[PDB]
Amino acid sequence: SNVPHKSSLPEGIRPGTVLRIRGLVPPNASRFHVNLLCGEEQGSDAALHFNPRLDTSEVVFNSKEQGSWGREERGPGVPFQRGQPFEVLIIASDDGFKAVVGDAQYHHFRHRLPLARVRLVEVGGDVQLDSVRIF
């Protein structure tokens, strides 16, 4: 069973915040996601949707605003593998979110929504989480 992991952020997140996600991509994984969302409602606007796609060998970044998706950005290749553990940082600055995978800077996603609207982090899909922490 895939069960979403939710972290409420009722005072939001400010520049200089680190979301640290550790887990395993299980053997039959298709894709999983890390979403920074504006509210608890299903289909909430998203400042960031980070979506490793093992099935298509891509990592997609997008936002959702006023109920519509933005233009996808892609990182280089896919630094995740079925059957292997990973660590991702998502780091908030004034300018955007930096994604770090393993020991490497991976992608910068410029803010599209104001960072102050973020209220929730949801991690789900085909992933077995070790831990999620927000600093």
Numbering used by the authors: 1 to 135
What is written in the article reporting this PDB entry?
Galectins are members of the carbohydrate-binding lectin family with specificity for β-galactosides. The CRD is about 130 amino acids long, and the β-galactoside binding site is conserved among galectins, while differences both in adjacent β-strands and loop regions explain the variation in oligosaccharide binding affinity. Human galectin-7 (hGal-7) is a 15 kDa prototype galectin with a single CRD, monomeric but capable of dimerization in solution. Consequently galectin-7 has shown major roles in cancer development, by helping either in the elimination of certain tumour types or in the growth stimulation of others.
The high resolution (1.4 Å) structure gives an accurate insight into the molecular architecture of the protein with 99.3% of residues in the favoured Ramachandran plot area and 336 water molecules observed. The overall ‘jelly-roll’ fold is conserved compared with the previously obtained native and carbohydrate-bound complex structures. The two molecules in the asymmetric unit have similar overall characteristics (rmsd of 0.73 Å for all atoms) with little differences observed in some previously disordered regions. At the N-termini in particular molecule B presented some residual amino acids from the histidine-tag cleavage forming a tail lodging itself between two crystal-related symmetry molecules. Compared with the available structure, residues 1–3 were well ordered in both chains as well as Pro10 and Glu11. The CRD itself remains unchanged despite a slight movement in the adjacent loop composed of Arg74 and Gly75. Six residues showed potential alternate side chain conformation, namely Val18, Leu89, Asp95, Arg110, Arg117 and Arg133. Molecule A had an unusual difference electron density around the buried thiol group (Cys38), which is not conserved among galectins. Cysteine was replaced with an S-oxy cysteine in the structure, with potential oxidation due to radiation damage.
